[PDB]
């Protein structure tokens, strides 16, 4: 439980940088722009997660379905094993049934 | 987001401060002091 003996340098965080000042700027693009583009189009990230949300099993299923043909060998094997484990656990294990 | 406990020092001291007048390893070791302090109370 030995806590550090010296004070750490105080991180000078500016809440008025470009990102923090323009964050969420176009969230109402469809509403205030004669709807043409959904806020889904502003989501930056993996291809199988742009405007989508699910539990771990659904995430793995969607990833294997969308980008499974480009994954590496070990990555695809780990994904298949995770899919199998999540299937068995969610369909056979638990309390509430 | 890895969250670890940083105030464990004080979490341990709040229990060890009630055992400093004991005899043996009950005044030093935490595992033996939590039991001796509960019986004390």
């Amino acid at each position: 439980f030995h806590v550090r003996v010296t004070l750490p340098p105080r991180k000078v965080v500016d809440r008025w940088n470009e990102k923090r000042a323009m964050f969420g700027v176009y969230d109402n693009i469809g509403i205030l722009g004669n709807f043409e583009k959904h806020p889904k189009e502003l989501i930056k990230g993996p291809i199988w997660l742009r405007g989508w949300k699910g539990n771990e099993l659904q995430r793995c299923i969607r990833k294997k379905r969308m980008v499974g043909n480009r994954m590496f060998i070990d990555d695809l094997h780990n994904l298949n094993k995770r899919i199998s484990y999540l299937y068995k656990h969610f369909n056979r294990h638990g309390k509430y049934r | 987001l890895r969250s670890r406990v940083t105030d464990r020092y004080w979490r341990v001291q709040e229990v060890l401060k009630h055992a400093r007048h004991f005899r043996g390893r009950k005044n030093r070791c935490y595992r033996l002091a939590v039991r001796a302090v509960t019986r004390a109370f």
């Binding site: 806590v3 550090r4 003996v5 010296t6 004070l7 | 940083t6 105030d7 020092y9």
Partner: peptide, 26 residues
């Protein structure tokens, strides 16, 4: 390395207390 400032400031207070208990000022 544990990310945090509360523990560091609290231990600074503890160090000041130990210093006062060791060398009592006039």
């Amino acid at each position: 390395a544990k990310k945090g400032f509360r523990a560091a400031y609290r231990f600074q207070k503890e160090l000041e207390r130990w210093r006062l208990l060791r060398c009592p000022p006039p």
